Amino acid sequence: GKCKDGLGEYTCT
Amino acid sequence: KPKLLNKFDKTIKAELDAAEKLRKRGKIEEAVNAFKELVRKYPQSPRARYGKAQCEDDLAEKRRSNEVLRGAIETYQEVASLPDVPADLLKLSLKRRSDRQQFLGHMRGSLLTLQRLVQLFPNDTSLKNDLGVGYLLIGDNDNAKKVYEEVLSVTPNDGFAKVHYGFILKAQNKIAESIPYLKEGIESGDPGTDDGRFYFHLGDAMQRVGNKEAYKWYELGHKRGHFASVWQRSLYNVNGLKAQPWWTPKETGYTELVKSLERNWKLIRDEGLAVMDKAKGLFLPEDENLREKGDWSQFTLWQQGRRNENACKGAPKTCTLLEKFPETTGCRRGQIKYSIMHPGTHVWPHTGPTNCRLRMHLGLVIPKEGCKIRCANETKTWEEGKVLIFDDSFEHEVWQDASSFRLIFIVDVWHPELTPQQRRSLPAI
Ligand SMILES: O=C(O)CNC(=O)C(=O)O
Ligand SMILES: [Mn+2]
């Protein structure tokens, strides 16, 4: 999953 | 404290000490050959093997090579294959393997290592926790939840396990359930609980349940250096960038891009409407749990600076228009997308992941009333053919209470004060 609009993922990178 | 020498290694402690000393002196060049010599002489010595692995590690730092580090990763496992390996040394060698495997992005491989560590040390809670992280880094929230559940059954007070359990719960939209775990977990003060992520999500979960203590945690999170400010709570940041909720075109320097969007806004609209009519499947619902209610879908042309070829076949002129502007098409921490929101929609207050982008909104179809967007302490409305610019790393909130749909065009640009080099190197989001 990707963080597009928010910060939902444990890591975005 | 940690005993690393087995029966045999104790009989060669001198040579082993001799070699290690060279490594500590920074002379990582001849320390390798030294441990390589001991490995050749004592091919079953764990400490000699671990020595070799550690020097290879440092050499990977000096040289900045992935192959030599990849080599060290194997040497670290080699240690575990040898006989009569002391527990402390066994744990150390495999932990560092995982660490570096995660550094290289071998998350799948780092998992098997962590599973092995938990199998070898079934009583070590901290390893179960690290295993949990292993699952989280591959997006396996289901298995991560099991792990932290397994941990809390035995250790209800482990704060690390609590924040992470709370994090998983909130990501599952178990908002109320998540709060005590996130809160108690941070308050525990255990190592690894002072993370911006848990501050960020505790406060958001609090906001959603109408708990006015939310900004008390945003404030604390800011005081501990996680948030640039209480309003701006992005976590992937380049410190120093001009921070303000609302920007004017002139302020961004991207005046040509704005002109182009506003001059050609009708073809942008029409191609979006055409997709709505004849290809509504290209519009995907927002899938980040940012909605309290309503319908919100997005049709994406660019993400992570990569063009979606099939999508652009639905908006060919629009994509052709934007190819002229690398400040947006090359923004690897932003998107270009149509965004449609229907009446009865409310988007929770939220923040984007990075301060490295500014967000442009071109009004395409804006009902006369009902649609508004708050960024920080100021609310604004869209106009058809007009560009709004805001920094979505600041808290912002959206409403749609019109009597028909609202369509906009979203264009992300690199933060203007980012140097060309920064724009080249920053990992994508
Ligand atoms: O697209 C919309 O209607 C709302 N957009 C946002 O909240 C955003 O761009 O970050
Ligand atoms: Mn947003």
Numbering used by the authors:
A (entry chain B): 99 to 111
B (entry chain A): 330 to 758
Text from the published report:
Here, we report crystallographic and biochemical results on the structure and substrate selectivity of AspH. The results reveal a key role for the TPR domain of AspH in substrate binding and, unexpectedly, that the preferred EGFD-substrates of AspH have a non-canonical (Cys3–4) disulfide pattern. Whilst the oxygenase domain fold of AspH is typical for the 2OG oxygenase superfamily, details of its active site and the role of the TPR domain in EGFD-substrate binding are remarkable. Whatever the precise extent of conformational changes during catalysis, the results reveal a central role for the TPR domain in enabling AspH catalysis—without it, 2OG turnover occurs, but EGFDs are not hydroxylated.
Next, we assayed AspH for its ability to hydroxylate truncated 26mer hFX EGF1 substrates (aa 86–111) lacking the Cys5–6 disulfide-forming residues, synthesized using orthogonal cysteine protection to yield selectively both the pure canonical (C26mer) or non-canonical (NC26mer) disulfide isomers. Only the NC26mer peptide was hydroxylated under normal assay conditions, whereas both 26mer peptides were hydroxylated using redox buffer conditions. A structure of AspH in complex with NC26mer was obtained (AspH-TPR-Ox:NC26mer). Comparison of AspH-TPR-Ox:NC26mer and AspH-TPR-Ox:hFX structures reveals little overall difference (Cα RMSD 0.13 Å). The presence of a Cys3–4 disulfide bond indicates that the additional residues present in the longer 39mer substrate, which were not observed in electron density maps of AspH-TPR-Ox:NC26mer due to disorder, are likely not essential for substrate recognition.
